[PDB]
Write a protein that binds this ligand. Structure first.
Ligand SMILES: [Zn+2]
Ligand SMILES: [Zn+2]
Ligand SMILES: [Zn+2]
Ligand SMILES: [Zn+2]
Lengths: 833, 196, 83, 243, 103, 220
């Protein structure tokens, strides 16, 4: 179809606008166009054809036409990635490429690592890690050498990351002498620089794996750090930060070499150089020995306090990191911190201008929370009460975050009655006065209320006054915000035995349930869920049986969260209140969900399936199965599969004695899709019952008789999926004679191709290994184990690989090995005493 | 596309079928018992029937029975001409004769570029088994066609009438077929097509 | 893609669990895995180890255990021959 | 029709008597309000497990513990700088460090941490059958008869903590007779005898390993080839007075 | 994974740490993606934890998980429980073409 | 080339084999034929299903066209849901009934066919005919003739089969020495209905596991 013509890139293709090298030459570029600019159904086919024939086409023309496409500026993230995927599949296919085209591809996909999104970063890493095995060590090393000498900061940054991905892919032991080359190179300055950064991204990508390799890198740090070049010296200091953080306290013995020059750099060069240096030493702090930690921390804290006034952003960010790490030191006392560090902290770094920039606000909050551990919690929050009542809304937000992360760890039990009062007062003030739309306030406020609960009652009343006050408001943002706060505060109210207050909450929310805005309505239903869950059903005001019939129309509201919380709450009434709602109304629920689960949400769809268990416990299981089986006939796969799930859960809660006979008839129905839904529903209903299927196994085997024998690879597939769960949970019951049958029908299917069929059949045979035991399952595998056919062999050695994985000692007695069978045999097997 | 016909399942233990071949197995799919080919949709079934594969298997099954013992540019005004059927008789049986008349230089004055203009009307015997509506069938039609004018048909319930035996002395100018040369006349000067 | 993953998992499972017959495996390579696992279990279970000790009649049981360990390598036959 | 289906009830009347493993630690303090003495021993046969004391110069049944339903392939006590509880490795690959406790009116065996390793079977890749613990109790080491060796760094706190495993993998080297050398807290060092699985000749070569607490990995130190006749290794503690 | 093919696993010797999964992926056995009768908490090698990447969902590799992942009783018997470190290193063609599809 | 032409003859391979008839011509190209013969001819191994070397994807079967869709196990067919829901081109039933069908009625029940140790299902095979076969070897015995085959034979009641006269001259069946037939070795007055004779056997426990009681789990 060639959907969405690209005029410039197509006229860039030229080729056919309207001779085997001309035919492959043409069809190849035609396919490439199918991928880049084309129809989804078309490009999906051109992918399979391009990969199947990827070995046939010459990589010279493949990459010759393909690569320069990505050099244009008119590409889009969609299309560029559509070509990237072909790059990956072809490179991983051919597996061998000449060095010039290796260089071309590495240059083309090299910038991908720098893109802002980890989505592109990931595939940019994938092309390089797949190419590394293709080209090898020597090729890539010959590629990076002329590039590291480039004068372009951009490209140097690019192949820094690229070289790192190569080092991780082929190992950093093989690429390490190259790191020593660009590292220790006396020739070029940028070669030193990038040679140092490569160590950075190597440390980041390896993570903890950098330990065993940390010896060679610290050589480059110690020798190349001494360079007179300020940028070099800085980048080395950053490498110490990354390799220390990823290092974890082990590496101290190695870092002791570079430990010394950092301090003489600190006391002298100052400036941003001291920013990077204190970043490095700060990262060294956790790995320091307790005595050495004691000395060097006390040495650094003076420079920190002196540098509190730094107008620069970077230095403040570093200082916060150094305090963050030094907080864990046992040497510096919480008394020391409260007497000196903390008071000079809260006054300097909590100024309103601090709160303006988020990326700094992060480090501020996390640093403060790390301070809260050593500092007294009541002292920290004591200093944190004044920032709560400030009139700046983002500053109030940061003020909240600090309380959230702090109270989660420590809890508020340290606070006195008075400042505990001023705390909740401040939280209510900032909560009712909030201008900005953000989800944090109700979350963290709820965390505080979960932390302290019995103490809330005299505050618990006014808090709910504010709650209702916001529940009537003209802005849906504040509406759903306050509702989310409700659902969180519901469990706490139970601790004060306010239950009538929960009743009036249930009233007002139930009356506001008719709101037009879905985004708020969902949260309201969530608060309904918390209320009904917490409080006893009998004392619920509306009551429930009046609640649910108003819920039945809600299911058609579409959107998502409305059905999320709606299905959650309908399920809550399903398990909790079987009697209240009338069974015909429950049937209306069944029809509504049965129509509802076409939705694309796995949470809505899964929970929807789960509610049929409660509805099946309350109401007639056959009554549910009528609607379910009637819905199996629909062509839509989600309907078939998740109605099969419903049949499974109903068979779990009701028991298979009811559900299975009607299932078998629904299998007697001639329709394929129905039979598939039956077999899968049988799979799920078996995996949900561990000990039940043992008694039901024999009635299954005549059904699988026509299933496994059926011509359709689908029926054979899903039947094998039945044999998986059935065999796993029924293994060891003594039904092996039936399992022997079920297997005897499976063995002929081993040669069946396709990924789904082959993995379902493998898993089925592995389940049979547990129910039969290897010995017989072996006997088949043995009589087919080698064979001339080169195909039969490849097929059975898969089953024997999985068997060797699960069982080894189990197969030991069963090896058909005799002294005439093999030369050496084992002399000790024939010993008899 | 099914034309409302009911194809019974293979296991229902055989109402006469149009083609007693395409069935539905224990599953919902459609199959050709001879060809042993599975077909997803009735359209695929029709592709199978119109395909040479199925036909070859039909000829093989018949051999088993014996063992066991220009189209594009076609002008079309779709104008119904005037036929004049009349019961004839000679010796020694009864035959039919049709007299079809054509335009009197009324509209054929705008088209004279020797484009099949020399081609006379053509007749063919068609089985009603295939129609645009496919409702009822079971009889033959003596269709008569000319480029501009619209086709014409005449129902022939009698299995055989006037089907002669070596009328002339075996002279071989097939024209279109034995039927046309054997028993048709085209008065092109007066534009009258006789058929008997 | 899928089969291509099965190749990588073939490399990983082969690395962990040592011998796993992939497609073409020489009888010398595979039978060695057989011998190694059988001896492995004979010495691995204190039960079967105690058993082989008596039926063989060695003076001590660890002689049988370390015998099996030595018997895992091919050259141990020629080693016994050189005693 | 009557189903034959013989239903057998298995009982172990007398429990397996061949004692394959032992440990020297002091586990429970019984009948004494406050007492700490290193004299006690716990001995294990596969499934069955027993705990004996002496203290009188004459051995005593303490309690016969419940059946573990597994094959204990090694057992070694660990002593950390406290009640001495035994590290126990068995089938399932799990490294199960268990403390013998007094619960209700009897002694029951409580488990602290079990770490999943390999799979559930008796295997050559399974890092069991060769086990030892640092005599100062800083780290536990498991190995396999052939493939690989794993060494956990054990740390104690308000709750016990097992450090991530330290892996070394030698594909063709069949390991036999793990013996760990005591240290002064310098660095843990263990010794093995590696027989090559795939070789033209029989070659049994000793190998030394020093686990580096600083670099957190095991380091191959000295590979000494000795005659194929080799049997076992033992650790000489110091020779600090000699050279 | 059981369903998406291109997803690559880790398979190293699991450490003491427990893998986290997000509320969105909650309930799936990381191998078979089954919701039934979970047994043992997943354990990952230290190489998959370290810094921020430790907080990721071991299943979808993107979101930050609160919950611990458990193996099901079918995988615990199949032994895939003890196979190695489950994690998804590559984001996968599905999630990729999803992100590039929307933006 | 040389390795392909180095192969020993299959008959040279037969001598190494204790059960030579299993080895086949394609075993000549077995890369390790002396070993593969030992494995394939080992006692309890079950040879690979032979649908390999065919490209038909193991089911092209013409017989697959004529296979019945399904049949309920008669014990489940007792549950009557067959009439309640019509599967061929609400339904509430008693919990005690269904539960008892699987447990009380159907505990000892087992499928009649199953398969054996080495039974492998080849494409052309259909088990059902062999099920009626095994069941028929059970019901039908010599000396008895069903009324249908009797009517087709046109044998009226009380009259002996036509092979009783030729059996008078030739003698009793060599395969059935103990067979008795009215009028000859057996009392004609005992001739009744469809049975004109019966085999008289001349031959004239607890199996350590006898349960002596059968009690199924109760739902209630
Ligand atoms: Zn056909
Ligand atoms: Zn991992
Ligand atoms: Zn997730
Ligand atoms: Zn699972």
């Amino acid at each position: 179809d060639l959907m969405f013509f690209k005029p410039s890139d197509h006229k860039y293709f030229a080729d056919v606008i309207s001779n085997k090298d001309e035919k492959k030459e043409r069809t190849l570029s035609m396919l490439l166009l199918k991928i880049k600019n084309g129809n989804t159904a078309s490009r999906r086919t051109s992918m399979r054809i391009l990969t199947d024939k990827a070995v046939t086409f010459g990589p010279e023309m493949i990459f010759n036409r393909l690569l320069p496409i990505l050099l244009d500026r008119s590409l889009e993230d969609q299309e560029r990635h559509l070509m990237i995927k072909t790059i990956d599949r072809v490179l991983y296919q051919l597996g061998d490429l000449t060095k010039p085209y290796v260089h071309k591809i590495l240059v083309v996909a090299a910038p991908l690592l720098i893109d802002e999104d980890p989505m592109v970063r990931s595939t940019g890493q994938e092309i390089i890690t797949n190419l590394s095995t293709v080209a090898g060590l020597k090729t890539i090393l010959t590629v990076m050498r002329p590039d590291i000498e480039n004068e372009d900061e951009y490209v140097r940054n690019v192949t820094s990351r690229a070289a790192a991905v190569v080092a991780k892919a082929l190992g950093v032991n093989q690429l390490l002498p190259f790191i020593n080359a660009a590292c220790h190179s006396r020739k070029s300055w940028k070669a030193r620089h990038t040679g140092i950064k490569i160590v950075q991204q190597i440390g980041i990508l390896l993570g903890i794996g950098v330990l065993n390799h940390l010896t060679g890198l610290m050589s480059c740090i110690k020798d190349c750090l001494m360079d007179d070049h300020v940028p070099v010296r800085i980048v080395t200091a950053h490498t110490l930060s990354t390799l220390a953080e990823n290092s974890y306290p082990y590496g101290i013995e190695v870092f002791n070499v570079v430990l010394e020059p950092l301090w003489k750099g600190i006391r002298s060069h100052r400036g941003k150089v001291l920013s990077s240096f204190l970043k490095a030493v700060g990262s060294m702090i956790p790995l320091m020995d307790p005595e050495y930690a004691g000395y060097y921390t006390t040495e650094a804290m003076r420079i920190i306090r002196r540098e509190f006034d730094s107008p620069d952003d970077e230095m403040k960010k570093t200082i916060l990191l150094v305090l963050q790490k030094c907080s864990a030191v046992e040497s510096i006392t919480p008394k020391f911190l409260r007497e000196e560090i903390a008071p000079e902290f809260f006054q300097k770094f909590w100024v309103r201008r601090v709160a303006l920039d988020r990326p700094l606000n992060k480090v501020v909050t996390y640093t403060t929370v790390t301070l809260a551990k050593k500092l007294g919690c009541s002292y920290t929050i004591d200093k944190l009460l004044t920032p709560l009542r400030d009139e700046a809304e983002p500053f109030r937000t940061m003020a909240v975050h600090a309380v959230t992360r702090t109270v989660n760890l420590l809890g508020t039990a340290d606070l006195d009655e008075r400042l505990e009062t001023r705390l909740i007062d401040a939280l209510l003030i900032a909560f009712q006065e909030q201008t900005n739309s953000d989800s944090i306030i109700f979350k963290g406020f709820g965390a505080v209320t979960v932390s302290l609960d019995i103490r809330m009652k005299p505050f618990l009343a006014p808090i709910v006054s504010t709650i209702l006050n916001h529940l009537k408001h003209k802005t849906p943002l504040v509406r759903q915000h306050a509702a989310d706060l409700c659902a969180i505060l519901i469990p706490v109210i139970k601790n004060c035995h306010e239950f009538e207050m929960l009743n009036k909450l249930n009233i007002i929310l139930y009356e506001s349930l008719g709101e037009v805005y879905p985004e708020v309505l969902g949260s309201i239903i969530n608060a309904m869920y918390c209320i009904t869950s917490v409080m006893d059903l009998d004392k619920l005001q509306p009551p429930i049986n009046q609640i649910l019939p108003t819920l039945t129309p809600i299911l058609r509201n579409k959107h998502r969260k409305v059905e999320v919380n709606t299905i959650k709450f309908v399920g809550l009434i399903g398990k909790l209140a079987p009697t209240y709602a009338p069974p015909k109304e429950w049937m209306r629920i069944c029809f509504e969900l049965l129509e509802l689960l076409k939705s694309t949400n796995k949470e809505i769809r899964r929970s929807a399936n789960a509610t049929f268990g409660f509805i099946a416990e309350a109401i007639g299981p056959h009554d549910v199965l009528v609607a379910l089986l009637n819905n199996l006939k629909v062509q839509e796969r989600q309907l078939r599969v998740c109605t099969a799930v419903a049949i499974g859960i109903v068979a779990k809660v009701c028991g298979p004695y009811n559900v299975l006979p009607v299932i078998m008839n629904e299998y007697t129905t001639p329709e394929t899709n129905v039979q598939n839904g039956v077999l899968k529903a049988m799979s799920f209903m078996f995996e949900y019952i561990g000990n039940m299927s043992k008694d039901y196994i024999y009635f299954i085997t005549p059904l699988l008789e026509d299933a496994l024998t059926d011509r359709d690879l689908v029926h054979r597939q899903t039947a094998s999926n039945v044999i998986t769960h059935l065999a796993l949970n029924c293994s060891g019951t003594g039904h092996e004679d039936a399992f022997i049958h079920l297997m005897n029908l499976l063995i002929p299917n081993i040669f069946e191709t396709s990924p789904h069929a082959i993995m379902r059949i493998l898993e089925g045979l592995e389940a049979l290994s547990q129910a039969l035991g290897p010995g017989l399952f072996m006997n088949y595998i043995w009589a087919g184990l080698f064979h001339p056919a080169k195909n039969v062999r490849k097929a059975f050695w898969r089953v024997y690989n999985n068997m060797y994985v699960m069982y080894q000692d189990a197969m030991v007695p069963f090896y058909p090995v005799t002294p005439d069978n093999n030369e050496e045999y084992i002399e000790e097997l024939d010993l008899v005493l | 596309l099914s034309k409302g016909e009911n194809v019974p399942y293979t296991f229902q233990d055989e109402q006469v079928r149009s083609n007693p071949y395409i069935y539905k197995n224990h599953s919902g799919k459609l199959v050709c018992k001879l060809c042993n080919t599975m077909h997803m949709s009735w359209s695929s079934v029709e592709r199978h029937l119109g395909g040479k594969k199925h036909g070859l298997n039909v000829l093989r099954r018949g051999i088993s029975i014996e063992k066991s013992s220009x189209x594009x540019x076609x002008x079309x005004x779709x104008x119904x001409x005037x036929x004049x059927x009349x019961x004839x008789x000679x010796x020694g049986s009864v035959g039919l004769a049709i007299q079809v008349n054509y335009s009197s230089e009324v509209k054929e004055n705008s088209v004279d570029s020797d484009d099949k203009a020399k081609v006379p009307p053509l007749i063919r015997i068609v089985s009603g088994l295939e129609l645009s509506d496919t409702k009822q069938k079971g009889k033959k039609f003596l269709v008569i066609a000319y480029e501009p004018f619209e086709n014409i048909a005449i129902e022939l319930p009698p299995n055989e009438i006037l089907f002669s035996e070596n009328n002339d002395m075996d002279n071989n100018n097939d024209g279109v077929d034995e039927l046309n040369k054997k028993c048709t006349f085209w008065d092109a000067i007066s534009k009258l097509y006789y058929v008997q | 893609a899928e089969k291509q993953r099965q190749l990588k998992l073939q490399k990983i499972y082969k690395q962990k669990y040592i011998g796993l017959g992939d497609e073409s495996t020489t009888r010398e390579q595979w039978q060695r895995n057989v011998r190694n696992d059988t001896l492995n279990t004979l010495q691995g279970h204190s039960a079967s180890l105690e058993y082989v000790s008596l039926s063989r009649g060695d003076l001590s049981i660890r002689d049988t255990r370390i015998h099996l360990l030595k018997s895992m390598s091919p050259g141990y036959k020629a080693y016994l021959r050189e005693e | 029709a009557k189903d034959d289906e013989l239903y057998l009830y298995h009982l172990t009347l007398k429990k397996q008597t061949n004692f394959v493993h032992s440990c020297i630690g002091h586990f429970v303090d019984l009948e004494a309000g406050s007492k700490r003495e290193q004299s006690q021993l716990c001995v294990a046969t596969e499934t069955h497990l027993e705990l004996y004391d002496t203290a009188d110069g004459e051995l005593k049944l303490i309690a016969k513990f419940q059946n573990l339903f597994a094959t204990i392939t090694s057992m070694k006590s660990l002593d950390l700088p406290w009640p001495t509880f035994l590290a126990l490795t068995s089938d399932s690959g799990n490294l199960s460090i268990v403390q013998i406790i007094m619960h209700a009116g009897a002694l029951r065996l409580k488990t602290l941490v079990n770490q999943p390793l390999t799979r559930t079977t008796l295997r050559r890749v399974s890092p069991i059958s060769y086990m030892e613990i640092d005599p100062n109790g800083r780290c536990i080491i498991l190995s396999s008869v052939e493939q690989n060796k794993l060494c956990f760094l054990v740390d104690y706190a308000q709750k016990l903590r097992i450090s991530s495993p330290l892996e070394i993998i030698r594909p063709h080297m069949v390991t036999l007779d793990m013996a760990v050398v005591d240290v002064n807290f310098n660095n843990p060092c263990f010794v093995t005898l590696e027989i090559d699985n795939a070789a033209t000749q029989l070659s049994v070569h000793l190998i030394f390993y020093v686990l580096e607490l600083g670099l957190n990995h095991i380091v191959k130190k000295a590979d000494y080839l000795v005659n194929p006749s080799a049997n076992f290794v033992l650790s000489l503690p110091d020779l600090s007075r000699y050279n | 994974s059981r369903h998406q093919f291109d997803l690559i696993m880790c398979l190293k010797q699991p450490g003491v740490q427990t893998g986290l999964l997000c509320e969105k992926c909650d309930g799936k056995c990381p191998i078979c993606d089954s919701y039934v009768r979970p047994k043992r908490k997943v354990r990952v090698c230290e190489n998959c934890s370290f810094g921020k990447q430790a907080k990721n969902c071991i299943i979808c590799n993107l979101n930050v998980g609160v919950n611990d992942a458990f193996y099901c009783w079918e995988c615990c018997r199949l032994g895939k429980d003890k196979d190695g470190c489950p994690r998804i290193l590559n984001l996968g063609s599905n999630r990729l073409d999803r992100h590039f599809e929307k933006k | 080339k040389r390795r392909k032409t180095e192969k020993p003859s299959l008959s040279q391979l037969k001598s190494q084999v204790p059960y030579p008839q299993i080895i086949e011509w394609y075993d000549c190209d077995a890369r390790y034929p002396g070993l593969l013969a030992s494995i394939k001819c080992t006692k309890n191994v079950i040879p690979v299903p032979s649908h390999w070397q065919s490209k038909k994807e193991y089911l092209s079967g013409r017989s697959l066209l004529g296979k019945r869709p399904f049949e309920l196990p008669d014990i489940i067919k007792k549950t009557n849901i067959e009439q309640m829901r019509s599967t061929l081109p609400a339904l509430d039933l008693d919990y005690k009934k269904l539960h008892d069908v699987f447990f009380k009625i159907g505990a000892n029940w087992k499928p009649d066919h199953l398969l054996c140790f080495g039974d492998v299902y080849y494409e052309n095979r259909n088990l059902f005919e062999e099920t009626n076969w095994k069941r028929m070897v059970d019901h039908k015995r010599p000396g008895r003739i069903s009324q249908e085959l009797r009517a087709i034979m046109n044998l009226p009641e009380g009259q002996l089969p036509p092979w009783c006269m030729k059996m008078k001259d030739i003698g009793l069946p060599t395969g059935y020495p103990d067979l008795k037939i009215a009028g000859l070795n057996w009392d004609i007055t005992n001739l009744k209905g469809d049975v004109y004779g019966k085999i008289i056997p001349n031959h004239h426990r607890n199996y350590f596991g006898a349960l002596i009681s059968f009690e199924t789990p109760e739902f209630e």
